[PDB]
Design an enzyme around this catalytic site. Structure first.
Site, PDB file in Angstrom:
ATOM      1  CG  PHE A  22      -1.985  -1.042   1.197  1.00 46.13           C
ATOM      2  CD1 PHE A  22      -1.783  -2.218   1.911  1.00 46.13           C
ATOM      3  CD2 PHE A  22      -3.161  -0.884   0.498  1.00 46.13           C
ATOM      4  CE1 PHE A  22      -2.726  -3.219   1.920  1.00 46.13           C
ATOM      5  CE2 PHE A  22      -4.117  -1.877   0.500  1.00 46.13           C
ATOM      6  CZ  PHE A  22      -3.900  -3.054   1.216  1.00 46.13           C
TER       7      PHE A  22
ATOM      8  CG  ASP B  59       0.787  -6.005   8.143  1.00 43.15           C
ATOM      9  OD1 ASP B  59       0.788  -7.081   7.452  1.00 43.15           O
ATOM     10  OD2 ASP B  59       1.133  -4.912   7.587  1.00 43.15           O
TER      11      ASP B  59
HETATM   12  N1  LIG Z   1      12.039   1.898   7.459  1.00 47.18           N
HETATM   13  C1  LIG Z   1      12.532   1.350   6.318  1.00 47.18           C
HETATM   14  N2  LIG Z   1      13.866   1.322   6.080  1.00 47.18           N
HETATM   15  C2  LIG Z   1      14.357   0.780   4.942  1.00 47.18           C
HETATM   16  N3  LIG Z   1      13.599   0.234   3.965  1.00 47.18           N
HETATM   17  C3  LIG Z   1      12.256   0.207   4.081  1.00 47.18           C
HETATM   18  C4  LIG Z   1      11.634   0.771   5.284  1.00 47.18           C
HETATM   19  N4  LIG Z   1      10.303   0.606   5.131  1.00 47.18           N
HETATM   20  C5  LIG Z   1      10.100   0.000   3.933  1.00 47.18           C
HETATM   21  N5  LIG Z   1      11.268  -0.242   3.325  1.00 47.18           N
HETATM   22  C6  LIG Z   1      11.432  -0.860   2.009  1.00 47.18           C
HETATM   23  O1  LIG Z   1      10.197  -0.744   1.321  1.00 47.18           O
HETATM   24  C7  LIG Z   1      10.009  -1.862   0.453  1.00 47.18           C
HETATM   25  C8  LIG Z   1       8.623  -2.433   0.732  1.00 47.18           C
HETATM   26  O2  LIG Z   1       8.429  -2.205   2.121  1.00 47.18           O
HETATM   27  P1  LIG Z   1       7.004  -2.007   2.841  1.00 47.18           P
HETATM   28  O3  LIG Z   1       7.196  -2.256   4.331  1.00 47.18           O
HETATM   29  O4  LIG Z   1       6.332  -0.709   2.455  1.00 47.18           O
HETATM   30  O5  LIG Z   1       6.237  -3.257   2.199  1.00 47.18           O
HETATM   31  P2  LIG Z   1       4.803  -3.644   2.773  1.00 47.18           P
HETATM   32  O6  LIG Z   1       4.925  -3.654   4.301  1.00 47.18           O
HETATM   33  O7  LIG Z   1       4.364  -4.850   1.981  1.00 47.18           O
HETATM   34  O8  LIG Z   1       3.890  -2.457   2.179  1.00 47.18           O
HETATM   35  P3  LIG Z   1       3.273  -1.164   2.940  1.00 47.18           P
HETATM   36  O9  LIG Z   1       4.072  -1.045   4.222  1.00 47.18           O
HETATM   37  O10 LIG Z   1       3.540  -0.015   2.005  1.00 47.18           O
HETATM   38  O11 LIG Z   1       1.787  -1.508   3.015  1.00 47.18           O
HETATM   39  C9  LIG Z   1      11.150  -2.821   0.748  1.00 47.18           C
HETATM   40  O12 LIG Z   1      12.106  -2.723  -0.310  1.00 47.18           O
HETATM   41  C10 LIG Z   1      11.787  -2.330   2.034  1.00 47.18           C
HETATM   42  O13 LIG Z   1      13.211  -2.488   1.956  1.00 47.18           O
END
Ligand SMILES: Nc1ncnc2c1ncn2[C@@H]1O[C@H](COP(=O)(O)OP(=O)(O)OP(=O)(O)O)[C@@H](O)[C@H]1O
Length: 287
Positions: free
Chosen positions: A11, A113
């Site tokens: 998202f 989650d």
């Molecule tokens: N705090 C953070 N530091 C480094 N990389 C991050 C961080 N948060 C997200 N990412 C990066 O974002 C990408 C997807 O992460 P994200 O956590 O957003 O996926 P998700 O949990 O499936 O989706 P969302 O959180 O957007 O609903 C990955 O490549 C991850 O390395």
């Protein structure tokens, strides 16, 4: 100040950055009352093993959430990374996750989650928990543009059978799954569908009797299962010692109340017993 694209997520688009003047390196996440409440909360929270929300900003059509930047998440460590190999490391991760979770629970919050890619690690191997989902994800709903398989592989049985009431047990089950992924290096219960997912839960763990899970049947989406004998944990987890086996035990108890709590987990022998947690820059990074 933008500095790099990091990845798409269920998202959000997520973008590495050294935020306007803010010299900390940072990850920004790009995407209505409750959502505002969740933002100010994750913000108000403060815990070594809980991700830092640093700001949100945005005008209706976009929201951008600022978190301190993390090297990786526990997924990339599990994942394919055969360079990485995990023993008693596993203890450290759990130590943190649970402490992180214990705090969350203490603060009347379910992280809703958890999965390996929401247990992040910073430069120095501090494990932090990702934003409790809705804190973006489903909170403000418009979905990204992403490929990558989707993952209901950590849903407790109570949520798959569609319990419209849940608690700590929801998280504790996911932790169980993570602890499994760690030890197994493959997804523990990779179901195609809630129903398939319930199958893999039951043929692995056994079908719960009414003695084991009481009230199991009146669960809204409950539908009947072949009565599987399940595999004794020690046959699923050869690597595992009895002390760990006992933690896996508690995390997977079916009855969400019998199911270990993050505190109770923490006080278990596993986390005092002798191969202690690896201090955690000793904790292995991927490339
Ligand atoms: N705090 C953070 N530091 C480094 N990389 C991050 C961080 N948060 C997200 N990412 C990066 O974002 C990408 C997807 O992460 P994200 O956590 O957003 O996926 P998700 O949990 O499936 O989706 P969302 O959180 O957007 O609903 C990955 O490549 C991850 O390395």
């Amino acid at each position: 100040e933008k500095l790099d694209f990091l990845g798409e997520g269920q998202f959000a688009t997520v973008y590495k950055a050294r935020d306007k003047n803010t010299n900390q390196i940072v990850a920004i996440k790009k995407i209505n009352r409750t959502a505002l409440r969740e933002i100010k909360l994750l913000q108000e929270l403060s815990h070594p093993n809980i991700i830092g929300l640093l700001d949100a900003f945005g005008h209706k059509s976009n929201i951008s959430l600022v978190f301190d930047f993390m090297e990786t998440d526990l997924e990339v460590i599990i994942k394919d990374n055969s360079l990485v190999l995990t023993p008693s490391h596993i203890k450290a991760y759990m130590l943190m996750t649970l402490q992180g979770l214990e705090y969350l629970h203490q603060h009347w919050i379910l992280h809703r989650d958890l999965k390996p890619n929401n247990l992040l690690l910073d430069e120095n191997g501090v494990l932090k928990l990702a934003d409790f989902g809705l804190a973006k994800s489903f909170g403000s709903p418009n979905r990204a543009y992403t490929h990558q398989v989707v993952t209901r592989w950590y849903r407790a049985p109570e949520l798959l059978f569609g319990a419209r009431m849940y608690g700590v047990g929801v998280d504790m089950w996911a932790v169980g799954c993570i602890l499994a992924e760690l030890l197994l290096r493959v997804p523990f219960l990779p179901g195609d569908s809630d129903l398939d997912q319930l199958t893999r839960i039951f043929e692995t763990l056994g079908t719960p009797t009414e003695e084991q899970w009481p009230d199991m049947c009146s669960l809204p989406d409950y539908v009947t299962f072949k009565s599987f004998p399940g595999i004794p944990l020690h046959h699923i987890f050869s690597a595992a010692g009895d002390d760990l086996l006992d933690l896996i035990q508690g995390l997977f108890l079916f009855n969400p109340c019998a199911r270990i709590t993050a505190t109770q987990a923490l006080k278990m022998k596993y986390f005092s017993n002798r191969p202690g947690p690896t201090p955690g820059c000793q904790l292995p990074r991927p490339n």
